[PDB]
């Protein structure tokens, strides 16, 4: 290859954080096959993208303006402040006017046609034929009561986005030779056997075990395990799952490879150890630590191509379909869906149940299933249902044709909605049997098609590549595919970002292992901090970089005087940058907190579900005033977090008035709000914001089953906006403490106008969510699988069914939630006080 060609690939590696030309852990060529296979989709999308629009990446939505944002326009007139040449002028614009038309009524109001409208201080643009009201930035301004400020400048040059050119009827059987681990303690004596499963979509087709034996550094069987199922009957994407029990180790092996070939030969598989069920148990990858890991040795020696329902049965069938996603299917249930297959096809909500009713261990039956998909008319014409689509992409479906129809239905998503679900789609890639998938190809295209999506795709993929041995190989290949298509402008941006984040990660760890647990910091700890940051500033760190959680904002130089270390346990950095954009309205800095560590992946998963819950309320015209702060995971137990300005912790508001207890005063919160309000009109508005945002997080947390939290984890702004934080960690349903209630004008057993408004808001919010029950359930279950440790599929998930009061009616549901509120009144400060004792 060329001298430049190798330096480029070395640049890719630095961005990816994994070398995809490095073949150290693989038993086949699938990863290299997939690199080639992604070239066409990549190239297809680069070719179809408009250079101008790709360069300006307008952030837009086809959804209608909510009632709460219509009420903020009372004259049918929106005001845009344009800035040019040190002179600024307000202008009256109609909500239906396009950017090109308002620019028209600009040059008119004077008494050359190549200027674009950019937001001041941000990398946002208003352009294309869209109504100004359909621009996100505009809607964001109307919601927070912000004036819309826009500067007139030159469109960014599409030249900068340029892309470099490309250069048997036999029963299946497996011999278990044995298992070898380099070392073991002595011991104590225990017993070990091997369990071989044939798995397709977590359904077990066949199972065979070995005879238990004494656990020693090498254990031999050399026995053939003959299964019932025939070689010809193996479905594509079926896993041979090998597990050792005493459950200690597991490893997976794809039985049919990426070329449709049956797997054959000797295999020495290095397995994964269980930590003293989860998407990591599905992985076809083998443990990269080849020296210290348990391994299993097996042998494979053994090609594909190439009447109306009666009424009472119809009701049982419909009852099946009505149930939630995670309700289990009996055998009779399954046989009903399968026999009545043609009826089931007329009910898009039955697709997940019907496809779990397929016997995938039988080739004739799989064959029928494909014929069934052949007439897709009803599925193709149906309204897009995201939660339904999401069910076909989870761990219960390994068939590429089933999964592909889900992806077909994704194709109709506007960028706005792809952002909403991006994180969850990226995680779903883990459930893909093969590295090259319709879903993987769909993430590629959407990312290549739009810079905002592309930006987040990059960080989502990079997070997993950095902390996951299970999926990093497959993600790294998809990221490389993305990077070769995004343009050199974006390659440059990413390169600037990565250099900064890694340097600051180095520092984050270097301070953390200069410090202990308060006690505590410490002038010395803060001196070493500034010292290290001084060495980076000069020299050398990048002049500027995009903020990974807010790609609109460009960060400038550190402000080293305001940087510091946080008094907490984990000793996170508090960093502040100047904004690099000189057209920015204010002088405010950009705060960022670097933390090691909790798991910031759990925070990302929750914040995303939180933004989903918001959009659900937006369709019903509800505004619960949530605050999903930017949070990105960088590496194992490490990442960045957006600093929310003028915000404090509820705990810190109690210890200002009181000290290092623990003795919680009811009036404190309300005094803090009043003290922090410049006028009384802003304090009333703040009490209003706190009623909605409190109602918002009570309902949201109760459903996600995270409702029981310490006051250190809750925050509030000076404008009254309450928000939960740190999601990577007697009882209570959620947190409504006497101090929250006091702000609502309630001391226990007393109702008030603000507290009645609260209950009313909670119920409306809660009942709106219940209409989305399937969606929330699938999202929730996916989060557990992809984001938490090994959990119980059966009991942990079940919480949210109770939380969402499945099967009940809006009357019982309204009662149920109201009771929960009462439970919080009766507990008062008791759970809170106990949390304080558990961290003392
Ligand atoms: C462990 N802590 C640091 C933490 N983990 C988090 C995980 C996810 C999200 C947030 C997490 N925080 C977190 N995130 C804070 N963010 C500031 C407001 O946006 C959001 C970020 C935060 N803030 C305080 C208290 N805080 C009081 C005011 C102080 C100052 C006067 C300089 O403004 C500065 C220090 N704690 C204890 C905080 N923990």
Query: Is 600 annotated to bind ligand?
Result: yes
Torsion-angle region of 165 (φ positive above 0: left; ψ -120 to 50: alpha; else: beta): beta
The reply, when asked if residue 627 is annotated as ligand binding, is yes
Ligand 1 atom 4, closest CA: 726
Q: How was this structure determined?
A: X-ray
Rg of the chain over CA atoms, in angstroms? 29
3-state secondary structure of 717: strand
Distance CA 161, CA 492 (A): 10
Class of domain 303-487 as given by CATH: mainly alpha
Q: Is 647 close to ligand 1, i.e. is its CB under 6 Å away?
A: yes
* Distance of CA 146 from the midpoint of ligand 1 (Å): 25
Residue of 598, 725, 728 best suited for mutating to test ligand 1, as the one with most atoms within 8 Å of CB = 725
Segments of 623-762 assigned E as strands: 631-635, 638-642, 647-649, 714-717, 722-724
Nearest CA to ligand 1 atom 36: 649
3-class DSSP state for residue 207?
A: strand
Pocket test for ligand 1, best of 641, 697, 717, 721 (most atoms within 8 A of CB): 641
Q: What is the DSSP pairing of strand 239-245 with strand 191-200?
A: antiparallel
| Closest protein CA for atom 15 of ligand 1 | 643
The CA-CA-CA angle for residues 314, 315, 316, to 5°, reads: 95
Query: Does the C-beta of 262 come closer than 6 Å to ligand 1?
Result: no
Helix 438-449 to helix 39-48 angle, to the nearest 10 degrees?
30
Query: Mutation test of ligand 1: which of 726, 727, 729 has the most ligand atoms closer than 8 Å to its C-beta?
Result: 726
* Identical fold between 2-166 and 168-302: no
> Which ligand 1 atom sits closest to the C-alpha of 564?
32
282 is in an annotated binding site: no
User: Which among 827, 817, 782 is positioned nearest to 703, based on CA atoms?
Assistant: 817
637 lines ligand 1 (CB under 6 A): no
- Closest-CA residue, ligand 1 atom 5, reads 726
Q: Among the atoms of ligand 1, which is closest to the Cα of residue 646?
A: 33
Q: How far is the CA of 646 from the centre of ligand 1 (A)?
A: 11
Contacts of 176 (CB under 8 A, 6+ apart): 194, 196, 210, 221, 222, 223, 225, 296, 297, 298
Q: How far is the CA of 495 from the centre of ligand 1 (A)?
A: 28
Q: For ligand 1, atom 17, which residue shows the shortest CA distance? A: 643
Alpha-carbon distance 688 to 693, whole Å? 9
> Ligand 1 atom 28: the closest Cα is on which residue?
648
Residue with CA at minimum distance from ligand 1 atom 6: 726
Task: Give the orientation angle of helix 773-787 with respect to helix 600-619, to 10 degrees.
Answer: 170
Sign of CA dihedral 301, 287, 795, 605: negative
Instruction: Give the H/E segment covering residue 14.
Output: helix 3-16
Q: In Å, what is the CA distance from 187 to each residue of 178, 190, 191, 512?
A: 19, 8, 11, 36
Q: How far is the CA of 595 from the centre of ligand 1 (A)?
A: 10
Q: How far is CA 190 from the centre of its chain?
A: 41
Q: Where are the alpha helices (DSSP H) in 771-809?
A: 773-787, 799-803
Residue 840 Cα to ligand 1 middle (Å)? 20
What's the half-sphere exposure (Cβ side, CA atoms, 13 Å) at 696? 27
Tell me if 595 CB under 6 Å of ligand 1: yes
742 lines ligand 1 (CB under 6 A): no
Taking the CB of residue 721, how many other CB atoms lie within 10 A of it? 22
| 523 DSSP β-pair partners | none
Cβ neighbours of 649 (radius 10 Å): 15
Distance of CA 768 to the CA centre of its chain: 22
Q: What fold does the segment set 646-833 form as a domain?
A: 1.10.1070
**Cα 510 to ligand 1 centroid, rounded to whole Å:** 20
> Ligand 1: which residue has its CA nearest to atom 11?
726
Query: In the CATH hierarchy, which top-level class contains the domain 488-645?
Result: alpha beta
Torsion-angle region of residue 260: left (phi > 0), alpha (psi -120 to 50) or beta? left
- Give yes or no for a contact between 210 and 194, defined as CB atoms under 8 angstroms apart: yes
Q: Give the number of C-alpha atoms closer than 13 A to the C-alpha of residue 383, restricted to the C-beta side.
A: 3
- What is the per-residue DSSP string for 695-708? HHHHHHHHHHT---
Q: How far is the CA of 724 from the centre of ligand 1 (A)?
A: 11
How far apart are the two ends of the chain, measured CA to CA in Å? 61
492 labelled binding-site residue = no
Query: Regarding the domain delimited by 2-166, which CATH topology (the fold level of the hierarchy) does it fall under?
Result: Ubiquitin-like (UB roll) (3.10.20)
Is the bond into 642 cis (omega within 30 degrees of 0)? no
Which residues 6+ apart lie within 8 Å of 312 measured at CB? none
Determine if ligand 1 sits within 6 Å of the CB of residue 629.
yes
Tell whether residue 595 is among the known ligand binding residues.
yes
Query: Are residues 138 and 119 in contact, defined by beta-carbon separation less than 8 angstroms?
Result: no
Query: Which numbered atom of ligand 1 lies nearest the CA of 712?
Result: 37
Q: Confirm or deny that 837 is annotated as ligand binding.
A: no
Residues in Cβ contact with 534 at an 8 Å cutoff, skipping those fewer than 6 apart: 560
Instruction: Please state the φ and ψ torsions of residue 203, each to the nearest 5 degrees.
Output: -75, 130
* Position in ligand 1 atom list of the atom nearest CA 570: 1
The closest of 765, 701, 712, 762 to 734, measured between CA atoms, is 701
CB atoms within 10 A of CB 240: 22
Check pocket membership of 570 for ligand 1, CB cut-off 6 A. Answer: yes
Resolution number, Å? 2.4
Residue 272 neighbours by CB under 8 Å, 6+ apart: 249, 250, 251, 280, 283, 287, 293, 470
DSSP collapsed to 3 states, 560-628: CCCCEECCCCCCCEEEEEEECCCCCCCCCCEEEEEEECCCHHHHHHHHHHHHHHHHHHHHCCCCCCCCC
With b for 16 or more beta-carbon neighbours within 10 A and e for fewer, the 474-505 pattern comes to bbbbbbbbbbbbbbebbbebbbbbbebbebbb
CA dist 361 and 371 (Å) reads 17
Tell me if 727 is assigned to a ligand binding site.
Answer: yes
Is 593 close to ligand 1, i.e. is its CB under 6 Å away? yes
CA distance 585 to 150: 10
Are 752 and 745 a contacting pair, CB within 8 Å? yes
Q: Do 258 and 434 contact (CB within 8 A), yes or no?
A: yes
- Do residues 150 and 141 make contact, with C-beta atoms less than 8 angstroms apart? no
To which CATH superfamily is domain 168-302 assigned? C2 domain (2.60.40.150)
- Report the atom number in ligand 1 closest to the C-alpha of 648: 27
Question: Which stretches does DSSP call E strand in 23-111?
Answer: 78-84, 87-93
**Maximum separation of any 2 CA atoms in the chain, in Å:** 95
Which contacts (CB < 8 Å, 24+ apart) does range 442-446 have? 442/407, 442/410, 442/411, 443/478, 444/38, 444/41, 444/42, 444/45, 444/478, 444/481, 444/482, 444/485, 445/41, 445/44, 445/45, 446/415, 446/418
Asked whether 644 lines ligand 1 (CB < 6 A), one says: yes
Nearest residue (CA) to ligand 1, atom 21: 643
Task: Answer yes or no: is the C-beta of 564 below 6 A from any ligand 1 atom.
Answer: no
Domain boundaries, the chain: 2-166, 168-302, 303-487, 488-645, 646-833
Backbone CA torsion sign across 698, 701, 703, 706: negative
Q: What angle do CA 553, 559, 565 make, to 5 degrees?
A: 105
CA 403 vs CA 35, 283, 306, 362: distances in Å:
21, 17, 20, 19
Whether 603 lines ligand 1, by a CB cut-off of 6 Å, is yes
Rounded CA separation 142/78 (Å)? 9
Whole-angstrom distance, CA of residue 598 vs CA of residue 547: 21
* Nearest protein Cα to ligand 1, atom 26: 648
Which of 186, 112, 189, 190 lies closest to 152, judged by CA?
112
User: Of the candidates 264, 270, 199, which has an alpha carbon nearest to the alpha carbon of residue 25?
Assistant: 270
- Rounded to 5°, angle at Cα 176 from 174 and 178: 165
Ligand 1 centroid to residue 246 C-alpha, Å = 45
Instruction: Please compute, for residue 335, the number of CA atoms within 13 A of its CA located in the half-sphere on the CB side.
Output: 3
Query: What are the distances in angstroms from CA 327 to CA 343, 463, 662, 774?
Result: 21, 32, 43, 11
Coil, helix or strand at residue 104: helix
Q: Separation of 61 CA from ligand 1 center, angstroms?
A: 32
Q: Which atom of ligand 1 is nearest to the CA of 629?
A: 20
**Ligand 1 centroid to 50 CA: how many Å?**
41
Q: What gap in Å lies between CA 85 and CA 435, rounded to an integer?
A: 53
């Amino acid at each position: 290859m060329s001298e430049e060609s190798q330096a480029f690939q070395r640049q890719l590696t630095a961005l990816i954080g994994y070398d995809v030309t490095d073949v150290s852990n693989v038993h086949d060529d699938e990863l290299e096959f997939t690199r080639r296979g992604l070239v066409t989709p990549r190239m297809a999308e680069v070719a179809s993208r408009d250079p101008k629009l790709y360069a300006m990446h307008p952030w837009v939505t086809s959804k209608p303006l909510p009632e709460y944002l219509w009420k903020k326009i009372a004259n049918n007139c929106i005001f845009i402040v344009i800035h040019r040449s040190t002179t600024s002028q307000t202008i009256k614009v109609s909500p239906d006017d396009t950017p090109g038309a308002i620019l028209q009524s600009f040059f008119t109001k004077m008494a050359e046609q190549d200027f674009v409208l950019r937001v001041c201080g941000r990398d946002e643009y208003l352009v294309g034929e869209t109504p100004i009201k359909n621009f996100q930035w505009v809607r964001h301004c109307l919601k927070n009561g912000e004036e819309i400020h826009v500067v007139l400048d030159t469109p960014p040059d599409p030249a900068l986005d340029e892309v470099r050119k490309e250069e048997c009827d036999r029963k299946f059987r497996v011999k278990i030779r044995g298992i070898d681990i380099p070392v073991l303690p002595r011991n104590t004596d225990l017993t070990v056997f091997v369990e071989a499963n044939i798995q397709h979509g977590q359904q077990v087709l066949c199972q065979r075990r070995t005879s238990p034996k004494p656990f020693t550094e090498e254990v031999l069987w050399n026995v053939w395990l003959e299964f019932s199922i025939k070689i010809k009957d193996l479905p594509k994407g079926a896993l041979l799952n090998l597990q050792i029990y005493c459950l200690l180790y597991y490893v997976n092996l794809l039985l049919i490879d990426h070329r449709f070939l049956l797997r054959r030969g000797e295999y020495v598989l290095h397995m994964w150890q269980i930590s003293g069920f989860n998407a990591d148990k599905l992985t076809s990858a083998t443990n990269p630590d080849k020296e210290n890991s348990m391994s299993i040795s097996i042998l494979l020696d053994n090609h594909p191509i190439a009447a109306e329902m009666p009424n009472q049965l119809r009701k049982q069938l419909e009852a099946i379909i009505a149930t939630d996603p995670l309700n289990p299917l009996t055998a009779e249930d399954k046989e009903l869906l399968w026999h009545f297959r043609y009826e089931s096809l007329k009910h898009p909500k039955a697709y997940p149940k019907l496809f779990s009713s397929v016997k995938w261990g039988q080739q004739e039956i799989v064959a029928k299933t494909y014929q069934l998909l052949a007439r897709r008319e009803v599925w193709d014409q149906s309204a897009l249902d995201v939660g339904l689509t999401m069910q076909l992409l989870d761990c219960n479906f390994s068939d590429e044709n089933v999964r592909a129809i889900a992806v077909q239905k994704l194709e109709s998503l506007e960028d706005d909605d792809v952002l909403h679900y991006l994180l969850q789609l990226v995680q779903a890639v883990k459930f893909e049997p093969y590295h090259d998938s319709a879903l993987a190809r769909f993430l590629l295209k959407r990312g290549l098609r739009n810079k905002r999506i592309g930006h987040f795709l990059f960080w989502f993929l990079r997070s997993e590549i950095a902390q996951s041995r299970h999926y990093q190989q497959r993600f790294a290949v998809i990221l490389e595919a993305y990077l070769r298509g995004c343009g050199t402008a974006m390659l440059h941006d990413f390169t600037q970002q990565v250099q900064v984040i890694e340097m600051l990660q180095k520092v984050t760890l270097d301070i953390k292992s200069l410090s202990a647990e308060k006690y505590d910091v410490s002038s010395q700890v803060i001196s070493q901090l500034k010292q290290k940051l001084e060495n980076l500033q000069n020299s050398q760190l990048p002049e500027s970089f995009r903020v990974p959680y807010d790609p609109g904002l460009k960060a400038g130089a550190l402000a080293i005087e305001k940087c510091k270390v946080m008094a907490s346990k984990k000793k996170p950095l508090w960093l502040e940058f100047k904004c690099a954009d000189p057209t920015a309205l204010s002088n405010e800095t950009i705060g960022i907190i670097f933390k090691h560590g909790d798991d910031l992946r759990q925070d990302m998963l929750i914040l995303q579900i939180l933004r989903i819950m918001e959009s659900i309320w937006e369709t019903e015209s509800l505004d619960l005033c949530l605050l999903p702060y930017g949070c990105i995971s960088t590496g194992d137990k490490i990442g960045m977090i957006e600093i929310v300005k003028d915000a404090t912790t509820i705990a810190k508001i109690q210890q200002s008035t009181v000290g290092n207890t623990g003795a919680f005063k009811d009036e404190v919160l309300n005094h803090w709000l009043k003290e922090k309000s410049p006028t009384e009109e802003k304090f009333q508005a703040a009490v209003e914001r706190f009623v909605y945002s409190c109602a918002g997080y009570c309902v949201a947390t109760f459903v996600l089953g995270i409702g029981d939290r310490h006051n250190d984890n809750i925050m509030i702004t000076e404008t009254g906006n309450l928000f939960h934080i740190d999601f990577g960690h007697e009882r209570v349903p959620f947190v409504l403490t006497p101090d929250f209630l006091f702000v609502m004008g309630t001391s226990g057993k007393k109702t008030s106008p603000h507290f009645q408004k609260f209950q009313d808001i909670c119920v409306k919010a809660y009942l709106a969510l219940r209409h989305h029950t399937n969606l929330l359930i699938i999202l929730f279950s996916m989060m557990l699988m992809t984001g938490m440790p090994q959990l119980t599929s059966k009991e942990d998930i079940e919480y949210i069914r109770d939380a969402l009061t499945v099967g009940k009616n809006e009357e019982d549901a309204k009662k149920y939630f109201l009771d929960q509120i009462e439970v919080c009144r009766d507990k008062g400060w008791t759970v809170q006080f106990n949390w304080f004792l558990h961290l003392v």
